[PDB]
C-alpha cells in the first residue's frame, strides 16, 4: 500500500579475485546463488604480458524466449591463466557480465589484475 517500500551489488553477486605464482595465474569468481555469468561475455586481455590461449570451461545452459540458449556459469568460476612473460607493471584486463534469475541484468564489469613480473623462461 505504501508507494515507498532485493538484488545485491555486482561485486557481491560475483566476487572476483585472482592469485599468481610465477607463470601460474588463477582467476576466480564466487557466484552468488541465484545469479550467473555469461560465458560469451568474458574477455581476458594482457597488457605488457604474454599469455597462453585461455580455454573457458564447460558451463550449464540457460534458456529464454529471446536468445534461446546461452552457456552460463553458476556457484563458482575458476579460470587458470598461463603467464609466459610479464614486464614490471604488466596487467591483465578482465571483463565479464552476469544476471540474476529473478530477471535482472548487470552491465559489463572490468577488473585490472596487477601481474607480477615474469621473465622469458
Amino acid at each position: 500500500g505504501l508507494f515507498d517500500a532485493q538484488f545485491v551489488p555486482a561485486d557481491q553477486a560475483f566476487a572476483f579475485d585472482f592469485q599468481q605464482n610465477q607463470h601460474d595465474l588463477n582467476l576466480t569468481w564466487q557466484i552468488k546463488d541465484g545469479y550467473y555469468l555469461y560465458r560469451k561475455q568474458i574477455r581476458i586481455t594482457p597488457e605488457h604480458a604474454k599469455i597462453a590461449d585461455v580455454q573457458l570451461p564447460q558451463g550449464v545452459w540457460h534458456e529464454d524466449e529471446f536468445y534461446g540458449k546461452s552457456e552460463i556459469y553458476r556457484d563458482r568460476l575458476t579460470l587458470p591463466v598461463t603467464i609466459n612473460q610479464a614486464s614490471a607493471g604488466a596487467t591483465l584486463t578482465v571483463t565479464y557480465q552476469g544476471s540474476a534469475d529473478a530477471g535482472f541484468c548487470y552491465p559489463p564489469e572490468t577488473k585490472t589484475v596487477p601481474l607480477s613480473e615474469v621473465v622469458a623462461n
Binding site: L2, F3, F7, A10, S99, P108
Partner: protein, 118 residues
C-alpha cells in the same frame, strides 16, 4: 505501446523533468541485451491496465544498450545497479527511491504499485 520520450544524458533528464512540472514522471532504464528488460516491454508496459494507470504520467525512457560514456554517466548519477530499473518522481520533481522497481515485474503487480500514488 506506451509512448516514451527518449533521453540520453543527465541534462536531458533534468530538462524533461522541468518540462513535466506538475505531472508525475516515470523513468524506464532499458537495454536490448537485457532479457528482463525485454520481458518488461513485452508483458508489462503492454498491459491495458498498466497503460491506463500511466495515462497521466510523463513517460521518460533511457536506452542504455550501448553502455557508452553518457550511458554509464546517467546510470551512475541515478545510482542504478542494473536493468530493468524503473524510477518515479512525484509531480513536484522529487524522486521516490524507495518506490523504484528493480528487475522484471508482472503487470498485475506493477499496476498495483503504480496506483499507490493516490
Amino acid at each position: 505501446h506506451l509512448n516514451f520520450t527518449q533521453i540520453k544524458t543527465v541534462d536531458e533528464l533534468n530538462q524533461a523533468l522541468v518540462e513535466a512540472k506538475g505531472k508525475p514522471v516515470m523513468l524506464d532504464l532499458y537495454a536490448d541485451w537485457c532479457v528482463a528488460s525485454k520481458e518488461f516491454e513485452k508483458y508489462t508496459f503492454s498491459d491495458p491496465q498498466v497503460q491506463k494507470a500511466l495515462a497521466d504520467t510523463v513517460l521518460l525512457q533511457a536506452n542504455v544498450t550501448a553502455n557508452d560514456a553518457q550511458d554509464v554517466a546517467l546510470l551512475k548519477h541515478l545510482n542504478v545497479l542494473g536493468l530493468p530499473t524503473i524510477l518515479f518522481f512525484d509531480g513536484q520533481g522529487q524522486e521516490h527511491p524507495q518506490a523504484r522497481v528493480t528487475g522484471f515485474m508482472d503487470a498485475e503487480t506493477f499496476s498495483a504499485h503504480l496506483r499507490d500514488r493516490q
